[PDB]
Amino acid sequence: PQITLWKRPIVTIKVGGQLREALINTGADDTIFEEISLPGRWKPKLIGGIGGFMKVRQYDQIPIEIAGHKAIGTVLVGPTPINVIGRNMLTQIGATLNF
């Protein structure tokens, strides 16, 4: 698809056998969801650093479907106020910015 930016670019995601809404965020290195059960072994990760750190669970090699397109990558699970699709996943779907 082609997504214009007059509204926040929030899209439907398939992840962990569930559906979630998430913000497509070119400003985010990583993809993070609030609390979802995912498969495999996780490890703790501290993220952020600008004013403090948030501890999250890092799951690698998670399949997601982002508005119809399949991606595999790292998904962080933790107490984010806003689910986010970051560049790690956007590269996998071939997302570009165009003007």
Ligand X SMILES: CC(C)CN(C[C@@H](O)[C@H](Cc1ccccc1)NC(=O)O[C@H]1CO[C@H]2OCC[C@H]21)S(=O)(=O)c1ccc(N)cc1
Interface with a second copy (CB under 8 A): 1-6, 8-9, 23-29, 50-51, 69, 81, 84, 87, 90-91, 93-99
The structure tokens listed for 11 are 């899209």
Please report, for residues 4, 10, 28, 70, 87, the alpha-carbon distance to residue 55 in angstroms, rounded to integers and kept in the order given. 33, 24, 16, 27, 20
Closest CB 78 distance from ligand X, rounded Å: 7
Residue 37 or 50 having the CB closest to a second copy:
50
CA atoms of 47 and 3, how far apart (whole Å) = 28
The footprint of ligand X (CB under 6 A) covers: 23, 25, 27-28, 32, 47-54, 80-82, 84
